[PDB]
Structures are given as C-alpha cells and as structure tokens.
Amino acid sequence: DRINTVRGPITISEAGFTLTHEHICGSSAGFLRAWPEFFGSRKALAEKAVRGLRRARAAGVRTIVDVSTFDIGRDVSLLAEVSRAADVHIVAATGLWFDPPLSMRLRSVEELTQFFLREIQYGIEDTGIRAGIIKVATTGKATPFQELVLKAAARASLATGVPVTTHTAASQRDGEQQAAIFESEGLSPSRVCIGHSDDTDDLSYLTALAARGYLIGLDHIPHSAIGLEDNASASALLGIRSWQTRALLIKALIDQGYMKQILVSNDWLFGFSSYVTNIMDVMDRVNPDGMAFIPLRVIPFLREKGVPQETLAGITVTNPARFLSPTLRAS
C-alpha cells in the first residue's frame, strides 16, 4: 500500500502522473561531491533541478522515478532537497548501471544482493532514504558481472516486492537476455520494465516481451540528434530518429493490445558528467521542455493520433502505480 520516496512513504494514490525513468543528475559515484564546479556549483545544479521539476509539476507531473544508481552518482540528499523544494515526489533507486567500480565489480551475487537489500530496506547511505526500485543495465550481451547484477536484482525484488527497471541496447534486443536471467531467478515479468525500448523500431521484439508480461519502457521519446547530424557525440547518444517516430511506438503497442504494459518517460536530467563536456547544453537545446516534454508534447500528440483520454491516463497514472507498488510473489 505504500511507495518509498525521498520524503518517505506515499500511498499509491498520491503518486498520480508519474515519469518512470528520469534523473536529477547523470554522474559517477562521489563525483558531484568531489567536483561540484563541473556543474557550476552544487547550488546551481539544485536550482536548475528545482526550476525544471516545478515546470514539470506545472504540466501535471506528480512523481518522477530517479533511476540513478550508486554508479550513476546518485546523491540522495540532493534528491531529497529538490523534491522538497519543488514539491514533486521522487522515487530513489538501488542497483548498478554499467560503470561499477572495482569494489562492486569484484563482488559475488550474494554480496550484491545484500547491498541492494540494504538500500531498499534500511536506507541509502546513512540517510534512512529507502529505494523504491532496482536499476540494472546491459549494452549488448551481458558481461559476466552484469549477469550477477541481474540475478541479485531479481533476488532483491523477490524479497522486497520492489520492481526492477533496465537500461538496454534495444537494437541488440538486450531485453530478451535480461528476461531470461530474471526468469531463471523466478522473477515475475510484471515486476520488470525493459527500458529504452523506444530506441528500436522492432516492433516484433517489443511485442514479444509485452506478451510475456514485461513492462516496456518507452523513455527516450525526446532523444534525437536530428539537426545535429554534425555532432558525432550527440548523434551517437541521441540517435537520428524523431520524437514522433519514437512516440508512435506507444500507439503501436497500444494498438497491439498492450496498453497495460507501457511506461513512458524522457530519461532527462539537469546535470550530466558521465559523457562529453557540454552534452547537457546540447540536450537542453534539443528539448527545452525537459521532463515536461511528455505531458506537454507526447500526450497531446498521441491523443491527436486517436489515443483515447482514458488510455493516456491509464498509461501515465495507472501503469506506474501498479509497477511501483511493492508486490510479493504469491506463494
């Protein structure tokens, strides 16, 4: 009946319109604290995040799920501060992305399970802030270490009921391997969201996963390097497909009957150090709406394409609630 946020537990009904894959800051463990000037200042970053969150809130966003793990440099204190200042619920994550340091990479599945459980059950660091989701990732075939992470993520989810969300190389169909690993651990597909799924047009891939019960994360909607074909780093990161092409995947999935398995987001951020310098500026120019892009542009676009109001509400409110609600497997 309750979802853990950086301000404490909230009831399922309080979540409202939720963005399921976002970040306050995309960084590295200890980075923000060791070199805050990379972002101007910690204060400047916080203020930027507050402005953006307030704008998203004005557009109807009530909660965001910050899928920043330990290795994405998640700073829960920052999350709590901006959540309170902007009055937006923020769900924190545990798990490991693709940049784990040696102290993590050398751990066993059992040790990692303990670490994920710690963050979900006791709290992140010494803050008492409990994670409400487990984030994992692969970029093509999983590495041996990534397989361990996925297994530990499954074990932690099974013990706590918190869902798992992933980063994929959609092109490479990472989702299938991820699903395989999760199922080998007994995890229900309904507890998993296969992310960045809009990065591919393979509707066969998407639909096959949906059919098995997985949640499909169409969270890269505003990501596009169109108009910047000349910026190699940006093109590499953002792609050359339009936001409309990506958004159309939502309707496609709806049309195929999987409206209840879709999760939409922007995968936006206010600071980004884990890539080339200046990527944030480039991204902000591409999508000035930031996290508000979904409600301001995507939802109206889909409605214009014939998606009914109730399906839109179902996707942005109902689906996230059901996914985030901690749910233990029936015995």
Handedness of CA 48, 82, 62, 191 (dihedral sign): positive
* Site for ligand OCCc1ccccc1 contains 319 (CB under 6 A): yes
CB 65 within 8 A of CB 311: no
Tell me the catalytic residues: 21, 23, 135, 167, 196, 199, 220, 267
Ordered DSSP codes for 12-80: HHHH-SEEEEE-SEE--TTHHHH-GGGGS-HHHHHHHHHHHHHHHHHTT--EEEE---GGGT--HHHHH
Contacted by 118, from Zn ion, a copy of itself, Na ion, none: CB < 5 to 8 Å by type: a copy of itself
CB 239 within 8 A of CB 223: yes
* Site for ligand OCCc1ccccc1 contains 315 (CB under 6 A): yes
* Site for a copy of itself contains 38 (CB under 8 A): yes
Any binding-site annotation on 135?
yes
Stretch that binds ligand OCCc1ccccc1, among 104-112, 129-137, 165-173, 312-320 (CB under 6 A): 312-320
Binding footprint of a copy of itself, residue count (CB under 8 A)? 34
* Site for a copy of itself contains 125 (CB under 8 A): yes
Residue among 259, 264, 292, 302 that touches ligand OCCc1ccccc1 (CB under 6 A): 259
**Residue with the CB atom nearest Na ion in the bound state:** 130
Among the listed residues 252, 265, 240, the one whose alpha carbon sits nearest the alpha carbon of residue 63: 265
Any binding-site annotation on 223?
no
* Site for Zn ion contains 267 (CB under 5 A): yes
Q: What's the closest the beta carbon of residue 72 comes to Zn ion, in angstroms?
A: 7
CB 255 within 8 A of CB 302: no
Q: Which of the residues 250 through 289 are near a copy of itself (CB under 8 A)? A: 273-277
Q: What share of the chain is helix, strand, coil (3-state, %, to 5)?
A: 50, 15, 35
> Scanning the structure block, which residue is given the tokens 């994360």?
217
* Binding-site sequence positions: 21, 23, 135, 167, 196, 267
* Binding-site sequence positions for Zn(2+): 21, 23, 135, 167, 196, 267
